[PDB]
Enzyme design. Structure first.
Site, short mmCIF file in Angstrom:
data_model
loop_
_atom_site.label_atom_id
_atom_site.label_comp_id
_atom_site.label_asym_id
_atom_site.label_seq_id
_atom_site.Cartn_x
_atom_site.Cartn_y
_atom_site.Cartn_z
N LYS A 181 -72.29 -4.69 -52.67
CA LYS A 181 -71.36 -4.94 -51.56
C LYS A 181 -70.22 -3.93 -51.65
CE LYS A 181 -69.18 -8.70 -54.15
NZ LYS A 181 -68.84 -10.14 -54.04
N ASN A 215 -67.81 -3.93 -54.59
CA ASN A 215 -68.25 -3.52 -55.91
C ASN A 215 -68.46 -2.02 -56.04
OD1 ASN A 215 -68.12 -6.01 -57.04
ND2 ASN A 215 -70.28 -6.54 -56.72
N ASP A 221 -69.55 -3.60 -61.10
CA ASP A 221 -69.68 -4.95 -61.65
C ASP A 221 -71.15 -5.30 -61.92
OD1 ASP A 221 -69.56 -7.74 -62.15
OD2 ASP A 221 -67.77 -7.93 -60.90
#
EC number: 2.7.11.11
Lengths: 18, 350
Positions: B170, B173, B186
């Site tokens: 997304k 991240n 992440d």
């Protein structure tokens, strides 16, 4: 419009997982 | 045919080079995976600069004393981690991070623990997340979105060859570094999984339909998520949204998506093949694997090797405000960090 719907959705900010 | 002999041999040779690269990349990964590094620094090696974010731990900007280098330090309270029942996810995230190596993956430079906390010391990218840039600009043009998408495709090709499923793609991240290239950050939901797994995790807008529908799923959920990301980058909003998560899920499983009229035909066709509910037709999950994506018309102008080599001029460079531009982040209550030895055996491997 789709864009206005996006704003009206309340999910324009950073989105949490899970 | 579509390709004469010259172009066919060129593509053939390129795809053999990918396999040879992945074979060696799997070797380097497995060795670090079976024997992870631990205790490669200590807290007194750093000067605390700015809390940049705060559950299960904090994140502060640190400055190495012997090198001057700035790093983003993830500080994790061991007792809070044990209490939130996050032992495995914490352990597995660090183990993946110390083992992987790719141009578009954030690098874990040091890790260590003391009596109270776990420390993960990442190279610091002052550019900031793609999310803020996307919301500011509104939407990326297709060449701009394609440049980021190509980096995600290669990163997923690398990760999936290691049997890693990422599961949290997304804009939040994804960071834009000082050369304008993507850093994936992440790994808290990533899992090394050969076959299927079943955990309900991810972010609603990016959830593949087979996760919503409670069946087992495989790495193909990452290719769906790529479809969401490309659409959001080029539209400015995601393909599936509503006031509440439940209504998001209903649109995701419906098998219908609508496109802005400014989307090119090539983009819409790529997205119909990524945002494909039917797993037997989803690009990335077929016989030709990732090559159906890399060879798609929307990526015709993409030089994959040049992207990998970081030789393509990024379309956007964030304003390089120094190695310590803490002015882009919100101000947090600078809460100190104390150390009194708790939770020893739970974190032996860290």
């Amino acid at each position: 419009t789709t864009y206005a719907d996006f704003i009206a959705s309340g999910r324009t900010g950073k989105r949490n997982a899970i | 045919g579509h390709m004469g002999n010259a172009a066919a041999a060129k593509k053939g040779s390129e795809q053999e080079s990918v396999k040879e690269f992945l074979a060696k990349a799997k070797e380097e990964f497995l060795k670090k995976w079976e024997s992870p590094s631990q205790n490669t620094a200590q807290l007194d090696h750093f000067d605390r600069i700015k809390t940049l974010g705060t559950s299960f731990g904090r994140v502060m900007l640190v400055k190495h004393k012997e090198t001057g280098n700035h790093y983003a330090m993830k500080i994790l309270d061991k007792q809070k981690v044990v209490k939130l029942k996050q032992i495995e996810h914490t352990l597995n995230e660090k183990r993946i991070l110390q083992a992987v190596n790719f141009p578009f993956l954030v690098k874990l430079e040091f890790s260590f623990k003391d009596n109270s906390n776990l420390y993960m010391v990442m190279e610091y990218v002052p550019g900031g997340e793609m999310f803020s840039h996307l919301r500011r600009i509104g939407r990326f043009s297709e060449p701009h979105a394609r440049f980021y998408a190509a980096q995600i495709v290669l990163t997923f090709e690398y990760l999936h060859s290691l049997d890693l499923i990422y599961r949290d793609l997304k804009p939040e991240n994804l960071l834009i570094d000082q050369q304008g290239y993507i850093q994936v950050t992440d790994f808290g939901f990533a899992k090394r999984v050969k076959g299927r797994t079943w955990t309900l995790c991810g972010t609603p807008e990016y959830l593949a339909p087979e996760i919503i529908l409670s069946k087992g799923y495989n790495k193909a959920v990452d290719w769906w998520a790529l479809g969401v990301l490309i659409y959001e980058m080029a539209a400015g909003y995601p393909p599936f949204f509503a006031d509440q998560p439940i209504q998001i899920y209903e649109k995701i499983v419906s098998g219908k998506v609508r496109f802005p009229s400014h989307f090119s035909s090539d983009l819409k066709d790529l997205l119909r093949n990524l945002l494909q509910v039917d797993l037997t037709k989803r690009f990335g999950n077929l016989k030709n694997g990732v090559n159906d994506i890399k060879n798609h018309k929307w990526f015709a102008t993409t030089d994959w090797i040049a992207i990998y080599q970081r030789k393509v001029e990024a379309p956007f460079i964030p304003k390089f405000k120094g190695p310590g531009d803490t002015s882009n982040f919100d101000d947090y209550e600078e809460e100190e960090i104390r150390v009194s030895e708790k939770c020893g055996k739970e974190f032996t491997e860290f």
